[PDB]
């Protein structure tokens, strides 16, 4: 069980760790989060009390290094940093733990929610979508634009999601215009799965990561990417049975976890109605259809 200590909390802030969140008061003796489950990526995230605009946070994996948070009063944010000195870090943690100035990652034993949302999400894949190779952790915020959004403007601060465009030469074989536009199986299976992602696990990891960025940061381009990756599978007549089964589970936990009050902005009516009711896979998402019908019948 790993630890992310905080040097201090000089400004009032709502701190998120994964799907959990805690309010910290200005200069409250808060020194971090312990008992973080090893084996998954995690995200620590922030919303300042005095400017609820710019949700921002850090994707990290505790197996890759010792990470801490320190407020930078110049840049005005909580920054993640790596502590390279193992013995300094363990000594910092042990002291804060002894003085019980850390909150405990509040995982219920029965509760597989974080595993189910991050099943295919890999820290090495996050670092290729979020390019800052001098850090082992990845910064995301509300405002960062995607490579696709930028084409249609600072490349260093872009989210490099795989571009999906249903009306592109990439998506449409010359002479198979109608076939490939109405049945995206070649775009899904040859271009994206065999060609770019190499396997369904990498495709699902990007999908899951796009969703979490949309949910935790209200990142609009992430939401577009999540919907595009769902629509490409649903709009394909030919999908491996295992991918359809797994997609139903992935989407179920995403819909289950979404705040009830954010379904208006985070969910796209056209895509969901098309995927559940009109598409080739209209009958292949039993769990997803049942939670959507019971939790968001308005949207449908």
């Amino acid at each position: 069980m790993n630890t992310v200590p905080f040097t201090s909390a000089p400004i009032e802030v709502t701190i998120g760790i994964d799907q959990y969140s805690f309010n910290v008061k200005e200069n409250q003796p808060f020194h971090g989060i312990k008992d973080i489950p090893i084996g998954h990526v995690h995200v620590i995230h922030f919303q300042h009390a005095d400017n609820s605009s710019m949700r921002y946070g850090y994707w990290f994996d505790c197996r890759m290094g010792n990470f801490y948070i320190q407020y930078d009063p110049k840049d005005g944010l909580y920054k993640m940093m790596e502590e390279r000195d193992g013995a300094k870090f363990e000594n910092i943690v042990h002291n804060f733990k002894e003085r019980q100035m850390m909150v405990s990652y509040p995982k219920i034993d029965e509760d597989d929610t974080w595993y189910n949302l991050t099943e295919f999400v890999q820290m090495d894949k996050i670092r290729k979508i979020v390019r800052k190779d001098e850090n082992q952790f990845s910064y995301v915020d509300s405002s960062m634009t995607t490579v696709q959004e930028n084409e249609l403007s600072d490349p260093a601060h872009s989210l490099n999601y795989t571009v999906i465009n249903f009306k592109s030469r990439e998506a449409i074989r010359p002479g198979h215009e109608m076939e490939d536009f109405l049945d995206k199986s070649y775009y899904l299976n040859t271009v994206m799965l065999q060609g770019i992602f190499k396997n369904s696990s990498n495709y699902f990891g990007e999908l899951q990561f796009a969703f979490l960025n949309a949910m935790f940061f209200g990142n609009y381009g992430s939401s577009l990417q999540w919907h595009a990756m769902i629509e490409l599978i649903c709009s394909s007549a030919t999908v491996p049975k295992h991918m359809l089964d797994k997609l139903d589970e992935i989407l179920y936990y995403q819909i289950k976890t979404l705040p009830e009050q954010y379904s208006d902005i985070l969910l796209n009516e056209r895509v969901w109605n098309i995927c559940l009711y009109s598409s080739f896979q209209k009958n292949s998402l039993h769990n997803t259809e049942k939670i959507m019908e019971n939790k968001y019948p308005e949207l449908l």
């Binding site: 009306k167 592109s168 030469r169 449409i172 010359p174 215009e177 109608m178 536009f181």
Partner: protein, 237 residues
């Protein structure tokens, strides 16, 4: 974006553009079967591709053989239209290719955008105008070449005959849309108006009669009256 009343003059500027109407591509008669079910029998169709400035018509004849053993024909007709327009553009020299294609029905946008991916600089646009190009098959010579075709065929016409010698594109287009609007509202009455005087003929190389400027005013007036009469009936007003 969409072509409307506000930007009507754009049709007669020096940027090459084409209207594409797919109304007459897929044409059927509905009939009873021996067992008393209903069935359709396709007839020859056509794509109506018009340059509004010059009057050059690219009448692509859609022979019933293209539907043999195909499913979802009304869907396929939109994609076959987009294929044939794409092929027509690719067949033109670069300096003749359109800068814009305006589709008369929004259901043609995606099929045509996807077929024209190789031409990113050609804008595919819809129109808010209700254009009466469906009535093109009320022009006897266009109707005749479509129905007689035994294979896929492209036939070129000038739908303005020689009018551009005497009037502007704007006026020539107004006249064509008035004639087609009349033919669409009351075909029998429109045709009677166009031939009632036997002394005015259609030249072998023309579609419409050889009216003098004064006879065109009389005809145009008779077409406006026909359209309002019919409208008064339709709506009881």
């Amino acid at each position: 974006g969409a072509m409307n009343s506000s930007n009507y003059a754009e049709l007669f500027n020096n940027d090459i553009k084409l209207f594409v109407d797919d109304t007459n591509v897929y044409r059927v008669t509905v009939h009873k079967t021996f067992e008393g079910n209903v069935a359709t029998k396709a007839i020859n169709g056509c794509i109506f591709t018009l340059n509004p400035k010059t009057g050059h018509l690219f009448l692509k004849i859609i022979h019933t053989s293209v539907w043999a053993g195909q499913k979802r024909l009304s869907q396929l007709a939109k994609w076959k239209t987009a294929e044939e327009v794409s092929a027509l553009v690719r067949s033109l020299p670069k300096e003749e290719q359109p800068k814009q294609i305006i589709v008369t029905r929004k259901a043609m946008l995606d099929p045509l955008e996807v077929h024209m991916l190789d031409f990113p600089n050609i804008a595919i646009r819809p129109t808010e105008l209700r254009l009466p190009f469906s009535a093109a098959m009320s022009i006897d010579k266009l109707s005749d070449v479509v129905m007689k075709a035994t294979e896929p065929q492209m036939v070129l016409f000038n739908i303005y005959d020689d009018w551009l010698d005497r009037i502007s594109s704007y006026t020539a287009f107004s006249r064509l849309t008035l004639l087609l609007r009349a033919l669409k509202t009351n075909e029998e009455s429109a045709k009677m108006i166009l031939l009632s005087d036997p002394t005015i003929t259609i030249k072998s190389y023309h579609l419409w009669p050889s009216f003098t400027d004064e006879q065109w005013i009389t005809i145009e007036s008779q077409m406006r009256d026909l359209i309002l009469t019919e409208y008064g009936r339709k709506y009881n007003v």
